[PDB]
Amino acid sequence: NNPAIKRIGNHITKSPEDKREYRGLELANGIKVLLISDPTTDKSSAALDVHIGSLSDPPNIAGLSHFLQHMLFLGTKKYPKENEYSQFLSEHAGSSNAFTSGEHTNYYFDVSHEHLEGALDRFAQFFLSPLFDESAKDREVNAVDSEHEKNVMNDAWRLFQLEKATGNPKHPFSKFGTGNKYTLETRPNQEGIDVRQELLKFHSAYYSSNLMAVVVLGRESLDDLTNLVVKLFSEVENKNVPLPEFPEHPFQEEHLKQLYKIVPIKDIRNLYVTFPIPDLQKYYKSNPGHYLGHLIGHEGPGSLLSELKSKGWVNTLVGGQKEGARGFMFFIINVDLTEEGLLHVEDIILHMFQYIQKLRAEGPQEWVFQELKDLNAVAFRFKDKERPRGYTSKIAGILHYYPLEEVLTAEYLLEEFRPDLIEMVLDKLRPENVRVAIVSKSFEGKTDRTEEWYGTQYKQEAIPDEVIKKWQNADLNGKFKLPTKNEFIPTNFEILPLEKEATPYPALIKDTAMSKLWFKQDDKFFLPKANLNFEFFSPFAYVDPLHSNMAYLYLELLKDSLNEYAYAAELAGLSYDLQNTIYGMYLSVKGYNDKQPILLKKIIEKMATFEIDEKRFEIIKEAYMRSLNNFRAEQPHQHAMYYLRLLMTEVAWTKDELKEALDDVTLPRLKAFIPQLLSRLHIEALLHGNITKQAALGIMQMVEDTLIEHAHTKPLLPSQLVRYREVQLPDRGWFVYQQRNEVHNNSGIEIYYQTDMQSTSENMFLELFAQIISEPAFNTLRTKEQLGYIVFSGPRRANGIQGLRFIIQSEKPPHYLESRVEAFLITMEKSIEDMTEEAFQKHIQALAIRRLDKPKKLSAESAKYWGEIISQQYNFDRDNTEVAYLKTLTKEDIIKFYKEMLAVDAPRRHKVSVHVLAREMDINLSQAPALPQPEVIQNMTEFKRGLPLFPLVKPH
Ligand SMILES: COC(=O)[C@H](Cc1cnc[nH]1)NC(=O)CN(CC(=O)O)Cc1ccccc1
Ligand SMILES: [Zn+2]
């Protein structure tokens, strides 16, 4: 019946809890397509994934497909304005990104539901006729350089590329995917290449319809969506490109039995063990590598990690199958290393092979496969509903691997037990196949190679045959047992009926000296899940650096002692989060409600009766020292944010201070601290989910009762519930605090224009201003001026106060960034003056849609309430309130606000700047205004002392 469609799939299998509707099809040009109808959705989305990526770069131009991905955003023949796509999205409440992997290029956006067509049309042009404007190419090449620059001194990226540098250098695997200025401009100009041409060639050769999948999600019917996709995508030309394949492993014979000694940037100690394996993807119905991953990576009694941890050699372990590309995969087992572990690497690996050996001895286990199958079936049935943008991006990728009918279920449902495939993979995890990498500062000086892209210093050696043979003769070790039935697997999924006295917002249902309980029965999602959130206040959690360290160490020690038992819960969809804050502790327990009271109870019980294993203490204390030390290797913009938090909060201990105070933390001293911390508390909880009022009261009271029984806890006083204040900056001031980042050779800057206390009207002035300036700040500071890859603007909220911040990481110096942002703000008053009233309403509408976007899953609704609670504002209906107010605002209100609080000669401008300098320091463009001389902050304490502090916000 239809020339444009090759076929319509059968029914797409979905969870029976999934109210969205679906239709798969294949266009005549070969594009696999999933259509998703959600008449309830606030944002629509679409994604396109092309089955080409950096593994197909021309050898002489590294990073070409990554570059190309950047360039598609910057104009096409039908919408030639460089930032048409960005601006359209921004003005209709959308967003967009894209990524390039070895074999895919994935592009996605969301938009308000009623402007899908408009968004999708501009989007489709990416794949029909991009301009690759010459002048855009010159500029954007710097954005890609900067993206690489950021990655350079980071240990994950270095290791990632050293792996590729040490296999077969002829294999596409060894290519450098990001690219940079050298690879994408300098060297190609040197070599007479015209990059605009190369982009047109690569696009034309590889952006073929037969290599594409598209997902679209909207309020429209499945028929409307179909006509829509046929319309915008039928014209993508089919060039019938063979899908690249890499049947040959990049780790051939000579790349095996090798040892690599690598010097890291941070002070980390890791061991990476790797075996090449064939491509297991086509076995997705049985999934042998997940099976083995599950076992080798287990964390329960009997497990590999258990014994490594008991010998005091390792704290954490990752194991299982690692994606490679069509043709090859890897199997990994990686662990972090204690200082002892570092000297016992040979032994650690023997234990690995001993554990592998045990699996060979017992053979494949159908009951284990059965448990993965069941958990996966339950995870699927009751999956949370995804945010539309991520969902479309993800399915676009998997439309390339699975029959249309299976795309939703393919990654969840297991169908086939395959002892043959299990055994087959197992037979590859042998010493004669092994690669070993040790990452440690102890190799500084001792190395003889340099990886070319990142500068990684490392050494390579043959592992000696004595050593391989010792690994080959690994007997069984009786400390190693398979896991036993997982008792935490839930079976009760009843959705408790909705109560007569149930409310749209959480109700305060307990207001005692000890504890304040906010409660809501879920009236929206109906999954047998619940979230249980507790803020525990104690003045002794942050009274000083020493106490801070202790709170932290206590809670790390506790998590380490619970790990074995908690791991089962975690596989059963039941997990927890436990951390120290500046107010005392935070505990969250999330997942299936069916066995949640159990886990909860075990936590509070351990918490209140904890006995510290001294050896664990010593190891964790030491990881913590490195961890604080490792802050110096975080990125310049992270430093900038960090210093501003220290400058503007009433109380905050520096990393230095915590470090100094840490050699003072002794076992005696910690043992004494725990009961001190637990002795007086206040608890403010949010219990939200598939649970009743009375179940909720009981859970609350149980937590209280356990603390009382075991630690004798008594209530705090309403007065000692000190929430902290923000520094109040003088009318017309400007302060600069300056530091050096020692590792990275970029600078960072954060600029904060403080405004006033949060409240309905101050909130919406700032927020609308941010909306208006959001996309132009990106467009001006990154796209036109190319100051860096990281360019952010938006509201800052802390401690009840607020303002407007800019954050940029750059190669240029901060005084320079300063003036371009100031230049930008003028451009902004002017474009607000010049904009139509109707362009003004579009911005109101876009923010409105953003603020009113309904949470799609339980824990997003939770998060929203929790913010209301932890900020002590309790404004649960804030969104209809603020939106009502925002609609009454005019151009004039916003010009006044800007002129009062933000303009360079604003009467109430309150400006603070953190400048973080690079490793080594000390036109076409708009006019930057002359600036006042800043007060340079010398000392963070002198500075806070010398200034007022704001009130706190009044509760609702
Ligand atoms: C199937 O389970 C695993 O293989 C392990 C779990 C583990 C826990 N402690 C150690 N290992 N997880 C992984 O290996 C992580 N990724 C793969 C990898 O890079 O190794 C698998 C994964 C990630 C997200 C969600 C589900 C599986
Ligand atoms: Zn990029």
Curated annotation (Swiss-Prot):
Listed result of changing residue 789 to F: No effect on catalytic activity
Residues recorded with modification N6-succinyllysine: 150, 655
Consequence when changing residue 244 to G: Reduced enzyme activity
Keyword Lipid metabolism: no
Cofactor comment text: Binds 1 zinc ion per subunit.
EC number: 3.4.24.56
This protein's UniProt keywords: Allosteric enzyme, ATP-binding, Cell membrane, Cytoplasm, Host cell receptor for virus entry, Host-virus interaction, Hydrolase, Membrane, Metal-binding, Metalloprotease, Nucleotide-binding, Protease, Receptor, Secreted, Zinc
Residues engaged in binding Zn(2+): 66, 70, 147
Motif (SlyX motif): 811-816
Pfam family, one: Peptidase_M16_C
Localization per record: Cytoplasm, Cytosol; Cell membrane; Secreted
One BP annotation, GO: ubiquitin recycling
Binding residues for ATP: 387, 853-859
Residue numbers binding substrate: 294-300, 317-321
Family: Belongs to the peptidase M16 family.
Domain notes: The SlyX motif may be involved in the non-conventional secretion of the protein.
Name of the protein: Insulin-degrading enzyme
Name of encoding gene: IDE
